[PDB]
Amino acid sequence: AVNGKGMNPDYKAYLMAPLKKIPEVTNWETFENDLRWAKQNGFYAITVDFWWGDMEKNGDQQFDFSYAQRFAQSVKNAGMKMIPIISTHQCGGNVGDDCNVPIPSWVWNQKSDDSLYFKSETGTVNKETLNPLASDVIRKEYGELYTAFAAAMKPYKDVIAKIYLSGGPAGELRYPSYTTSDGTGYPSRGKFQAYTEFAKSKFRLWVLNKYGSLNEVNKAWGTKLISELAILPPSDGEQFLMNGYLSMYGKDYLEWYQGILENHTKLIGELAHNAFDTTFQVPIGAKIAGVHWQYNNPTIPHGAEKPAGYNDYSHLLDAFKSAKLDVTFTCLEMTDKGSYPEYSMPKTLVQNIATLANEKGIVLNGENALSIGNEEEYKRVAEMAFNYNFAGFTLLRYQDVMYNNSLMGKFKDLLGVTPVMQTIVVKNVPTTIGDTVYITGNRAELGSWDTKQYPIQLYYDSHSNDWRGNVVLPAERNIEFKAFIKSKDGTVKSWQTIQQSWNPVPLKTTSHTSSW
Ligand SMILES: [Ca+2]
């Protein structure tokens, strides 16, 4: 792993449930066996969406937690744990989709203005989730939904390992900037979604607030706005993204647009900590979408992210630290391409997020973006998960592994692991001052033979006068490894004479000793 350490000792693996309800897919009794198998394979919990549209369907406070309570008792029958997602967003809705669970149809009548939905630059309306702009309606409806959920789930606190919140569409904290209706699906640029009348007044009132009056706006921006109504979102998203963004106006607009998700993040964070904490005491998390296309496009840089609401990841992550929410990032199975026309750079994004997450001390978790049908993708997931300190990895989705024992078996070897602290000792290392000693080995957990950025560092035990390290390894997997010296200058100076091995690493903590 990066910075001379090993894999996150808290690492745990999770499986995503199907989108349909279990009784639509199998029967409770077969589920219980499937969970038991999944557990055999290193999975610790089943993550599952409970739809807002199912739980509060007929009207305000007319709750129905019966599917959720049943699902937990089976989880509890199988000796597993579960991570519920309170899916306050719409499931599917375009055929080919496995579900169609829109949010509760009565929530819209709560307002007679257009503040609860989204509208794009070209007027496309989106209603897959509530606009984080309407925070009064959010704080009521999600505070109520959170708090009732906590009441229906109390009898099961013992199988609840964490709770997820839905920050926006598809359960991600973003704007619905990439849709087929809005002519903005991968890999095209994203459209801004601040075109309701309500989003425009909000942007105006936040500018007047920041600078007082139109006269100081115009000084700040170098513009000649004739009246307060001319303060508006960008009139051409393409020019704004080509160069509009550099202007003072463009910084102010992006700062408000992303700021609305920093605010949302803090609101649900506070509503979920209040509903859940005292009773469950589990970590609460939220997700950021992996918007990897149009990343390194030379003339509309980050053309898909910005409109999604991601302009400054360091700022977005500070809001998560402040709400005490753990983050979940996706795309860990992908590689950078970065060529016309999609300009996709997923691996580079994941690395940037991980690094900011770890520097900020935010716990991190990952997911694959598409279904994995082959082991080379699992290998890529492991490189990222074990070298960038991921605390957990969740696999989408259930049916891919459950009815394919070959893939299940590949998943278990490479990602279904149990981390165990081990002591590695190397005697008689011929170092001179300023040299450092590292190990590197064949699995992803060992940095895959990398000597440049993932090697694990050892340390000198004066007393025993040897180099040693407490390293976390995957229990019960065969490993090959070698120590090596790195001169004060960063260059590999020499290698251990014989390749070492541990077959397999043992389940109980102990030491592996070897000689230079
Ligand atoms: Ca309600």
Side-chain angles (χ1 to χ4, degrees), residues 56 60-61 63 106 140-141 144:
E56 206 179 2
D60 193 31
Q61 298 304 89
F63 292 123
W106 50 269
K140 152 180 206 305
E141 305 305 338
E144 286 168 353

Side-chain angles (χ1 to χ4, degrees), residues 141-344:
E141 305 305 338
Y142 286 24
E144 286 168 353
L145 175 83
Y146 292 174
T147 291
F149 189 83
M153 303 311 281
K154 203 173 155 181
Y156 312 100
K157 70 152 300 177
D158 69 14
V159 286
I160 293 168
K162 161 171 174 147
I163 280 133
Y164 267 105
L165 314 178
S166 167
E172 296 149 348
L173 177 76
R174 33 181 202 88
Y175 292 98
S177 61
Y178 36 101
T179 59
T180 276
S181 313
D182 204 26
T184 71
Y186 165 99
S188 327
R189 64 162 191 110
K191 267 188 207 159
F192 295 88
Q193 317 286 319
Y195 294 95
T196 53
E197 299 305 312
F198 196 66
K200 290 162 178 179
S201 300
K202 280 307 190 67
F203 176 60
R204 190 167 295 128
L205 297 174
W206 176 95
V207 174
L208 300 173
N209 181 253
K210 174 174 201 170
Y211 321 95
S213 59
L214 190 58
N215 289 147
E216 303 287 303
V217 182
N218 271 336
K219 276 163 37 226
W221 289 358
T223 51
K224 302 252 209 66
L225 299 195
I226 195 106
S227 94
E228 301 81 359
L229 256 352
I231 290 157
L232 295 152
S235 35
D236 176 327
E238 196 190 359
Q239 277 304 132
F240 179 82
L241 286 166
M242 303 180 39
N243 78 299
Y245 75 97
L246 295 158
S247 87
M248 191 72 233
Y249 160 71
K251 292 175 186 175
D252 269 340
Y253 175 76
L254 290 170
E255 178 194 350
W256 161 86
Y257 181 87
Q258 168 184 310
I260 293 314
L261 319 153
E262 303 171 354
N263 286 327
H264 191 42
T265 301
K266 294 173 196 149
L267 171 66
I268 72 167
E270 144 178 46
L271 305 160
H273 277 285
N274 283 322
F276 303 131
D277 271 8
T278 14
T279 306
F280 310 78
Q281 278 152 292
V282 288
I284 304 176
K287 315 199 203 175
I288 289 160
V291 186
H292 49 92
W293 55 105
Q294 304 303 339
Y295 188 90
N296 75 323
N297 170 313
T299 60
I300 46 140
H302 300 291
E305 293 158 86
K306 297 191 187 186
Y310 313 149
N311 183 249
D312 190 324
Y313 289 111
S314 182
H315 260 78
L316 190 63
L317 296 175
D318 283 327
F320 273 65
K321 172 65 161 212
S322 100
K324 310 211 231 48
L325 300 178
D326 295 349
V327 182
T328 284
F329 204 79
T330 186
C331 281
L332 304 221
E333 78 286 19
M334 276 159 180
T335 49
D336 284 347
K337 295 214 160 88
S339 72
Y340 168 100
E342 329 63 14
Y343 296 101
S344 164

